[PDB]
């Protein structure tokens, strides 16, 4: 029940306390709930079937740009806010 705003502020205090992993692990969880990981998995197969040389680098050349675009905008904004909010505690108020 409107738990969004609460969850944000809570995370922020936890990360300050030394719980630094909470950012990366929380990103991971949003990506799984939304299904991002499974999509990248399939997009990878698609690329491999197209060119069919098993090479990792060239296949990463096309999978990576697309992968960064497919992350749901809510996941990117909420996670990017957590990073930004945290960074402000490391660097001067500006």
């Amino acid at each position: 029940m409107d738990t969004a705003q609460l969850k944000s502020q809570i995370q922020q205090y936890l990360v300050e306390s030394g719980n630094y992993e909470l950012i990366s692990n929380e990103l991971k969880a949003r990506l799984l709930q939304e299904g991002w990981v499974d999509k990248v998995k399939d997009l990878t197969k698609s690329e491999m079937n197209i060119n069919e040389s098993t090479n990792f680098t060239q296949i990463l050349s096309t999978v990576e740009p697309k992968a960064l675009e497919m992350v749901s905008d809510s996941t990117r904004e909420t996670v990017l806010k957590q990073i930004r909010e945290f960074l402000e505690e490391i660097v001067d108020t500006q």
Partner: peptide
């Protein structure tokens, strides 16, 4: 540089680390 440019540097680092792991399995 900027606080937002560093913010984006972190998120990009986190995401492309994951992406790499997924691509490397190749399946």
């Amino acid at each position: 540089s900027t606080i937002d440019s560093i913010s984006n540097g972190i998120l990009n680092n986190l995401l492309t680390t994951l992406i790499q792991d997924i691509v490397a399995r190749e399946t």
